[PDB]
Amino acid sequence: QISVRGLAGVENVTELKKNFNRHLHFTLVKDRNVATPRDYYFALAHTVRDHLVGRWIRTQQHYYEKDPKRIYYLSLEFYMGRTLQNTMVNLALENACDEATYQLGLDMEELEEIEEDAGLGNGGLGRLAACFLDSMATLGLAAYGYGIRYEFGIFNQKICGGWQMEEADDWLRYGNPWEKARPEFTLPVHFYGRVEHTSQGAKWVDTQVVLAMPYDTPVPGYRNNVVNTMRLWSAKAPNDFNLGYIQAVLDRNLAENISRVLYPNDNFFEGKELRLKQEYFVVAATLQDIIRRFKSSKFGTNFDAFPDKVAIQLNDTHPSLAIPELMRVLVDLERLDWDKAWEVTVKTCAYTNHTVLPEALERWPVHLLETLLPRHLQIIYEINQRFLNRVAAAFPGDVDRLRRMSLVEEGAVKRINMAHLCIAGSHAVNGVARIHSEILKKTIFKDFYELEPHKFQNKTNGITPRRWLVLCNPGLAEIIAERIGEEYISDLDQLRKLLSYVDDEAFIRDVAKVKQENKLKFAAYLEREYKVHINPNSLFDVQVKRIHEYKRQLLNCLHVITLYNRIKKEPNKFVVPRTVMIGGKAAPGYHMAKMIIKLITAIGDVVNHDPVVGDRLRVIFLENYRVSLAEKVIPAADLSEQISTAGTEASGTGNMKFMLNGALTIGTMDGANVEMAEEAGEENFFIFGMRVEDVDRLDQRGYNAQEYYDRIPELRQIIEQLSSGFFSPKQPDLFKDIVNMLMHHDRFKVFADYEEYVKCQERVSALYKNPREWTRMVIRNIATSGKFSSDRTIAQYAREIWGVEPSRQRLPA
């Protein structure tokens, strides 16, 4: 149908149809008389999968022959979403499959909806890893994603009585056609035990063994015939495990629990033993795999060349045990001297920090490491001693610096600071947006920056334009391709060419048409799937992201109520109609975040049924926000809410997705918002609120929320409404926790940005009244979004950290 979706050749369509029928019969053991839509999905998935394997086998063969430097991206999260459409897009198969299925009497879009999300992540950190895999393959890098194959990913969110309920995400129930089990490459992982000292050094003995079984998933590059591997480990008990008889077999579950479930915490550290086991499990299995592959190479025994052939990227501190595990292997098993092993380790490892929030920092109790990983604790102590000797020599007599920089934190319970471990043992440390990387050097890692300035870098985050434009917004990709061609899909900077169309009346009309079509499609989706009714002519005001105090969904709530109260006061006055959509999951143990969700639904319950309001204001909570829902709602958005307190959102990536898809942004000067506004021009962004410096000034003086309550009558009214039970008539004190927090212990200064936020929102409404000028501003946003491609981000990692050159050259098909 559309150009960007590739060719539908007579030869290709015929071949796809017959392979579809082959899989339905031989693979699924079905005929057309018993087959369900799910069977049809699987037959298509297997058909597309077949096209991958040839390229997969020759890509990996190519790496064996050429022996390039390999990049190992270690992450506890890979938030992949659905794979079918992504694979079709990257292989140029979308139109052909569309034609083949049409001729078989099936709707491909209907089949696509059957696939489960691979929800092996929480939010931004996990989705960044997924975008990175796509870009690394597209840029022809010899890259491997390594993680855990969780049996249960992020929970499915149900809303019951306005409250979040969690249910298990049994994503593997019907099987996963994309993975290939590799039980032949199973590796042992050790836990507990004790350290024995001999003449030949230390020995780790009396350990419990858990097996790590790898599952490989193909990662196709964009139309370059490169297919990389994501390898995920699954925990398996050994066959002599605990070997009355029946109980010993049933107790195998204890070992296998390691890969059972993703911890559903976003930006929050929970110090549980099972989580530590997960972290070591991925690290130990991966490093064995890396070393095996290094020894079995067409190059060289000699670990001097190890950093020339291997890069390990630590995604946050979660895989930080890679550092002492590499030391363990090099010193204890390979018998390298400490100094040499350390040189190799430092030159191999690099660390990406994702947040400055103290509650998110991993600080593991020494007693846990002592029991679980006794040799690693000894190695960490030795790393610390040698590191602090360096600090002492550089800053003689500075005794407080020594305590501040120690990897060992003293107190009631001794803890290991994993972030400090990562900096000491890595040659590169990067933040994820310019303002964030600056904050790291100025505040939390100031001491480390003073010691080793060369180590500290910035790599501004990005998103893949394949999933986040071509896949989810084909209508916009097409109208862009009509004007400037198809090259921008792997060279997003080319979108700048669109600035010469900002005064083009045809383009203006097409951009606005694509948005309305997206809005209609999403309005219909909401009716069919959730029986909720919205006005497609209203401004689509959306905030989608994990529920957090720092992300200030509560500030959004205050504005919504302000709008409602203003309507009730002057009912017959004209207001720009809005649909306010808020979605996202709260961590199961996060009480305040669960209360915020309840508040949002409670506001909807009042606002959506007030006859005086009409269709002028609607508040909808978007249930079960996840990658597949993001791909639907983002193309439909007019306004993107990026309203975190300045200095708290390290980067954000949702912000970039909205920019690429034709929404305007209301936001604080936080994370990547700053660089986005810089790229588009501040006139083309709705910036408001305190800057980082203003927050600091308020902290020094002391934040008093009462001041704002006293001086802003509209704010006072809302608080009174909340307190008195206006939004909860049956349970008048339901929101007392929220009010108390806002008034007395608000770390994120909701009230301080309220006035500027509301005024800025008025300016948004004013512009939306002028469709032509709204769209012209949109065009200026899309046209300058090129910097935020993860291809740019990965190219910078490649050149400035990993020491490898990216390549757009095709492999032979």
Token digits of residue 388: 């602090």
Is 354 labeled as catalytic in the residue annotation?
Answer: yes
Q: Is 449 annotated as a binding residue?
A: no
- Judged by DSSP in three states, 395 sits in coil
Q: Which of 58, 85, 800, 111 is nearest to 464 (CA)?
A: 85
Contact (CB, 8 A) for 670 and 649: yes
Q: Is 545 a catalytic residue?
A: yes
Question: What is the C-alpha separation between 39 and 30, in angstroms, rounded?
Answer: 8
Tokens of 684: 């083309």
* Torsion from C-alpha of 341, 346, 348, 351, nearest 10 degrees: 140
Of 337 and 359, the one with the shorter C-beta distance to ligand THM is: 359
Q: Is 304 annotated as a binding residue?
A: no
Window of 76-84, 162-170, 568-576, 780-788 that interacts with a copy of itself by CB under 8 A: 162-170
Q: Does 589 bind ligand THM (CB under 6 A)?
A: yes
Q: Is 49 annotated among the ligand-binding residues?
A: no
Does 550 contact ligand THM by CB under 6 A? no
- The CA distance from 651 to 670, in Å, is 7
656: phi then psi, degrees, rounded to nearest 5: -70, -40
Burial of 486 (0-12, 13-18, 19+ CB in 10 A): middle
Quick one: what does residue 590 bind among a copy of itself, ligand THM, none, with the CB cut-off 5 to 8 Å set by partner type? ligand THM
Q: Please give the residues from 224 up to 283 whose contact with a copy of itself meets the rule CB under 8 A.
A: 236-237, 239-241, 243-246, 249-250, 252-253, 257, 260-261, 263-264, 272, 274
- Distance in angstroms (rounded) separating the CA atoms of residues 685 and 581: 20
Tell me how far, at minimum, the Cβ of 568 lies from a copy of itself, in Å. Answer: 40
Whether the Cβ atoms of residue 795 and residue 139 lie closer than 8 Å to each other: yes
Judge residue 444's burial from the number of C-beta atoms within 10 Å of its C-beta, 0-12 exposed, 13-18 middle, 19 or more buried: middle
644 in a labelled binding site: no
Does 525 engage in binding with ligand THM (CB under 6 A)? no
Torsion sign over Cα 159, 161, 162, 165: negative
Closest approach of ligand THM to the CB of residue 621, in Å? 19
Q: For residue 265, with 0-12 CB atoms within 10 Å meaning exposed, 13-18 middle and 19 or more buried, which class applies?
A: middle
Residue 414 bears catalytic tag = no
Query: Which residue in this structure is represented by tokens 């929404």?
Result: 663
651 marked ligand binding residue: no
C-alpha to C-alpha distance for 192 and 187, rounded to whole angstroms: 17
Contact between 109 and ligand THM per CB under 6 A: no
155 in contact with a copy of itself (CB under 8 A): yes
Q: Quick one: which H or E segment has residue 580?
A: strand 578-583
Binding mask 317-356 for ligand THM (x = CB under 6 A): ----------------------------------------
Shortest distance, position 137 Cβ to a copy of itself, whole Å: 17
Helices (H) and strands (E) in the chain, counts: 32, 25
Single out the segment in contact with a copy of itself by CB under 8 A; choices: 107-115, 181-189, 405-413, 489-497. Answer: 181-189
Shortest approach of a copy of itself to residue 623 CB, angstroms? 16
| CA 624 to each of CA 178, 468, 586: distance values in angstroms, whole numbers, following the listed order | 24, 19, 10
Pairing of strands 208-220, 180-181: antiparallel
Pairing type for strands 539-544 and 578-583 reads parallel
Please state, in angstroms and as integers, the Cα–Cα distance from residue 90 to each residue in 15, 81, 83, 486, following that order: 19, 15, 11, 13
- Please tell me whether residue 181 binds a copy of itself under the rule CB under 8 A: yes
Q: Is 300 annotated as a binding residue?
A: yes
Among 170, 206, 337, 359, binds ligand THM (CB under 6 A): 359
Choice among 70, 236, 309, 545 that is catalytic: 545
* CB-based contacts of 713-716 (< 8 A; 24+ apart in sequence): 714/562, 714/565, 714/758, 715/558, 715/751, 715/754
Site string for a copy of itself, 11-50 (x = CB under 8 A): --------------xx--xxx----x-x-----------x
Which window, 8-16, 584-592, 614-622, 791-799, contacts ligand THM (CB under 6 A)? 584-592
Q: Given the residues 466, 519, 618, 657, select the one marked as catalytic.
A: 657
Q: Catalytic residue at 272?
A: no
Task: Give the residue with the Cβ less far from a copy of itself, 515 or 585.
Answer: 585
Smallest distance from ligand THM to CB 695, Å: 18
Length of the chain: 813
Give me the least distance between CB of 151 and a copy of itself, in Å please. Answer: 9
Active-site residue (options: 653, 665, 775, 784): 653
Instruction: Determine if 589 is a binding residue for a copy of itself (CB under 8 A).
Output: yes
Interaction between residue 265 and ligand THM (CB under 6 A) = yes
Tell whether 496 is in a known binding site: no
Give the Cα separation of 539 and 617 in Å (integer).
Answer: 10
Of residues 56-115, those binding a copy of itself (CB under 8 A): 56-57, 61
Sites of contact with a copy of itself (CB under 8 A): 25-26, 29-31, 36, 38, 50, 53-54, 56-57, 61, 152, 155-156, 165-168, 170, 173-175, 180-181, 183-184, 216, 236-237, 239-241, 243-246, 249-250, 252-253, 257, 260-261, 263-264, 272, 274, 588-589
Could you give the residue numbers annotated as active site? 354, 545-546, 551, 653, 657
Sites of contact with ligand THM (CB under 6 A): 265, 268, 359, 587, 589-590
Q: Which residues are annotated as a binding site for AMP?
A: 31, 64, 292-300
